[PDB]
Structure formats: C-alpha cells, structure tokens
C-alpha cells in the first residue's frame, strides 16, 4: 500500500538521524562485544542439546537392563514349570527391545 | 515415587551439562597428547638410569 | 472359572497396553520439548549474529 | 487363625517396602543436592576465571 | 531487532568511556587478585565434593 | 460420551496446574509421611481381627 511505503521512508529517515549520533569508532566495537554475547547464548543452548542426547542414552540403558531382568524372570518361570509366565516375561522383553531400537534411532539422529 | 524419579533425572541432566563443558575440553585435548608422551619419555629415562 | 481365566488375562492385557502408552507419552513429550528448543536456539543465534556482524 | 497369619505377614511386608522407600528417599535427595552443587561450582569457576583472565 | 542493536552500541560506548578511566597498570594486577579469589571459591566447592564422596 | 472425555481433559489440565505449584522435594517426603500413617491405620484394624479371633 502507498502509506506503508511512505511510512517506511519517514521511519527510515528518523532511524538514520539517530544512527549518525552514534560514534563509529566506539559503537563498532560495541557491535563486536554484542556478537561475543551472541556466541555466549549459542554455547548454553548447544550444551543443553548434549544433555538431551545423554538422556535418551539413559532411557536406552534402563530399558535394556529391564529386558535383562525380564529374561531372568522368564528363566525362573521355566525352572518352576510356569511356561505361561515365561511367555508373558518374553512379551515384556520384546516391547523393551523394540522401544530400545526406537531410542537407538533417536540417539543416532541426536 | 514416579514424580520423585522425574526429579532424580534433574541430576542425570546435570551430568550431560558437564559433558557439554567437556566438549570444549575435547578441542583443547591435543595438549594431553604432548603431556602423556612427555611423562612416558622422562619415565623411560628414569627406568634406564 | 473359565470366564475368570479369560477376564484375568484381559485385565492384564489392558494394563499392559496402558503401561505401553505411558512410556510412549514420556518419550513423545521429550522430543517435542527438545525440538522446540533446537529451533529457537539455531534460528536466534544464526539470525542475530549474521545481521549484527554485517551491519557493523 | 489362618487369616491372622496371612495378615501378620502382609503387615510386615508393607512396613518392609515402606522402610525400603525411606532409605531410597534419603539417597535420592542426597544425589540431587550434590548434583546441584557440582553444576554451580564447575560452571561458575570455569566461566569467571576464563572471562576475567582473557579480558585483563 | 533494530533497537537492540542501537541499544548495545550506545551501552558499549558508555562502557568504553568508563574502561579508559581505569589505570591499565593498577587494574591489570587487580584482575590477577580477582582471579586468585576465583581459585579460592573453586577449592571450597571441590573439597565439599570430597566430603560428599566420603558420605 | 464426548463431554465426559472433554471434561476429563479440562479437569486434568487444572489438576496439573495445581500439581506444579507443589515443591517436589518437600511434598515427596510428605507422601512418605502419609504412607506411614496408612500403615498406622492398617495395624489398628489387623489387631481388631485378633480380638475377634480370640472372641
């Protein structure tokens, strides 16, 4: 629209008037200081992604040791002749190894 | 117990925070290659003496 | 007594799929929190650094 | 009298798992206090020392 | 945003004006004194981790 | 019914909003204190069954 173009012109003149009150020698190194804190913001966020990557690796170690526990319960059920509980334990083991493969995939992307 | 376990994972998350700090240490790590070879070089001289 | 064996298996199978849904819920909620942080951090850092550096 | 043997074992088994939960509570609360201190100390010392030294 | 960039420029000029009133010979050893108390803070926290390990 | 499902969703959001005002460190040991009085209720009832057995 016409008034958008006129508005951006009058706003740009006012912004240039302010821009030439700023000393180029002093403000140009303030711009480098500002750019150094921008890197300070990026390092905090990047490190937080590493923590998230390690958290999916923790879930993977929990569900894999839970699958070892259920395998021992299946062995115990078979020595006690309770084959129906051994199948139930194997079903818990399968859902833990299948979710562990989903976490392995998530971890590879991370 | 379940909500307390979610609170326990705050410590686990803090362990990864130290791991990201260690990431900067991996770029610095070349100094450790010279450090490790140096201690074995004077140790070899001490064993030879 | 043959119906109570059937009901006792159906009750265990129901809690088994409720249990599965609860573990899936946590992993899905985690990915959504992570993805929201990745986007904000990557876009904010890239845009702010490039714009300020070029202008100065 | 066969029900009171069952109840006396169930009462002992309940306090046994309440007792277990109480010991676990203390160890979990300790790790959370320690982890909060480790993070603050490591980050504060590393950041303050490096920034001040480089600037000076 | 534009006013964030302008704000950081005017704040940086004021911070530089203050920075050149500080004598480089005297303040640079104050910076080393400050760095020595930073090590004083680290040793207290490290020792507290040893107590936690023993606990 | 549809309004039962919608009702349980809005009630669950309100219950979660209240749940995160509770400090996890303080309330988790209140939960263990509560569990200790649950055992206090069970011991009174169990002892009353012993009296009935003796009767």
DSSP state letters, A4-23:
HHHHHHHHHHHHHHHHTTS-
CA distance E21 to chain D (A): 15
B/e letters for B11-40, b = 16+ CB within 10 Å, e = fewer, are bbbbebbbebbeeeeeeeeeeeeeeeeeee
Nearest CA in chain C to E8: C52
Sign of CA dihedral F29, F31, F34, F39: negative
Which residues from chain B sit within 8 angstroms of residue A110, using beta carbons? none
On whether the CB atoms of residues B7 and F24 are closer than 8 A, the answer is: yes
Record: contact D49-E35, CB cut-off 8 A: yes
Other CB atoms within 10 Å distance of the CB of residue B8: 17
Which of the residues A29, A43, A52 would you substitute to probe the C interface, choosing the one with the greatest number of C C-beta atoms within 10 Å?
A52
Rounded to whole angstroms, the Cα distance separating C29 from C33 reads 6
The answer for residues whose C-beta is within 8 angstroms of residue F50's C-beta and 6 or more apart is D4
- Contact call for residues F25 and B7 (beta carbons, < 8 A): yes
Please choose, from the candidates B6, B14, C27, the residue with its C-alpha nearest in 3D space to the C-alpha of residue A106. C27
Q: B10: which residues sit within 8 A by CB, 6+ positions away? A: D32, D35
* Residue C47 burial by Cβ neighbours in a 10 Å radius (0-12, 13-18, 19+): exposed
User: By the 8 A CB rule, do A103 and A60 touch?
Assistant: yes
Burial of residue E42 (number of CB atoms within 10 Å: 0-12, 13-18, 19+): middle
C-alpha span between A49 and C38 (Å, rounded) = 8
Cβ–Cβ below 8 Å for E32 and D37: no
Contact A/F (≥3 CB pairs under 8 Å): no
The three-state secondary structure class of B1 is coil
Q: Establish if D21 touches chain B: CB-CB under 8 angstroms.
A: yes
Chain D residue with CA closest to B19: the answer is D39
E4 to chain C nearest CA, in Å? 10
- The CA distances from residue E45 to E10, E52, F20, in Å, are 39, 11, 31
Q: Cα separations (Å) of C49 from A44, C12, C53, F14?
A: 15, 56, 6, 41
Looking at residue B29, what DSSP letter applies?
Answer: T
Residues of C in contact with A91 (CB under 8 A): 16
Distance of CA E31 to the CA centre of its chain: 8
And the tokens for D36?
């909060």
Chain C touches chain D, with at least 3 Cβ pairs below 8 Å, answer no
Distance between CA A44 and CA B21 in Å, rounded? 10
Show the CA angle centred on residue F38, arms to residues F34 and F42, nearest 5°. Answer: 170
Query: Cβ neighbours of residue F4 under 8 Å, at least 6 residues apart?
Result: none
A15 contacts on E by Cβ (under 8 Å):
2
Q: Write down the experimental method used for this entry.
A: cryo-EM
Round the CA-based radius of gyration of chain E to a whole number and report it. Answer: 20
Header resolution in angstroms: 6.4
Q: Are A70 and A89 in contact (CB under 8 A)?
A: yes
Which residues on B lie below 8 Å from D43 (Cβ)?
Answer: 17, 21
Q: Specify whether the CB–CB gap between A75 and A89 falls below 8 A.
A: no
How does DSSP classify residue B49? Answer: -
Q: Which of E5, E7, E8 to mutate to test the interface with C (most CBs of C within 10 A)?
A: E5
Which residues of E make CB contacts under 8 Å with A? Answer: 2, 5-6, 8-13, 15-17
Q: Three-state SS for C56? A: coil
Kindly report the nearest CA distance between residue F11 and chain D, in angstroms.
Answer: 30
Nearest CA in chain C to A102: C27
Contact between D3 and F52 (Cβ < 8 Å): no
By C-alpha distance, which of B45, F20, C26 is closest to A55? Answer: C26
CA distance A109 to A104: 9
Do C45 and A45 contact (CB within 8 A), yes or no? yes
What residue of F is the nearest CA neighbor of B6?
A: F24
Q: How far apart are CA A87 and CA D31, in angstroms?
A: 38
Check if the beta carbon of residue A48 is closer than 8 Å to that of residue E26: no
Helices (H), B1-49: 2-28, 30-48
Number of C-beta neighbours around residue C45 at 10 A: 17
Token reading at A43: 């390092």
Q: Which residue of C has its CA nearest to A107?
A: C31
User: Torsion-angle region of residue A22: left (phi > 0), alpha (psi -120 to 50) or beta?
Assistant: beta
Please state, in angstroms and rounded to a whole number, the distance separating the CA atoms of residues E36 and E45.
15
- Rounded to the nearest angstrom, the minimum Cα separation between B11 and chain D is 5
CB contact burial A6-31 (16+ within 10 A = b; e otherwise):
eeeeeeeeeeeeeeeeeeeebbeebb
């Amino acid at each position: 629209g016409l008034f958008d173009r006129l508005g951006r012109v009058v706003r740009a003149n006012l912004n240039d008037l302010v821009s030439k009150a700023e000393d180029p020698e002093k403000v140009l190194e303030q711009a480098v200081i500002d750019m150094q804190e921008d890197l300070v913001q990026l390092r905090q966020a990047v490190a937080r992604t590493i923590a998230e990557e390690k958290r999916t690796e923790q879930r993977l170690n929990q569900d894999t040791q839970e699958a070892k526990k259920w395998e021992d319960r299946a062995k115990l059920a078979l020595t006690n002749g309770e084959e129906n509980l051994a199948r139930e334990a194997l079903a818990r083991k399968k859902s833990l190894t299948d979710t562990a493969a989903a976490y392995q995939t998530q971890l590879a992307q991370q | 117990f379940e909500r307390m376990e979610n609170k326990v994972l705050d410590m686990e998350a803090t362990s990864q925070a130290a791991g990201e700090l260690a990431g900067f240490g991996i770029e610095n790590q070349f100094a450790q290659l010279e450090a490790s070879s140096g201690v074995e070089d004077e140790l070899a001289a001490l064993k030879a003496s | 007594r043959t119906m109570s064996e059937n009901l006792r298996r159906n009750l265990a199978a129901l809690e088994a799929k409720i249990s599965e849904a609860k573990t899936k819920k946590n992993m899905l909620q985690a990915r959504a929190k992570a993805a929201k942080a990745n986007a904000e951090l990557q876009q904010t850092l890239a845009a702010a650094a490039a714009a300020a550096a070029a202008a100065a």
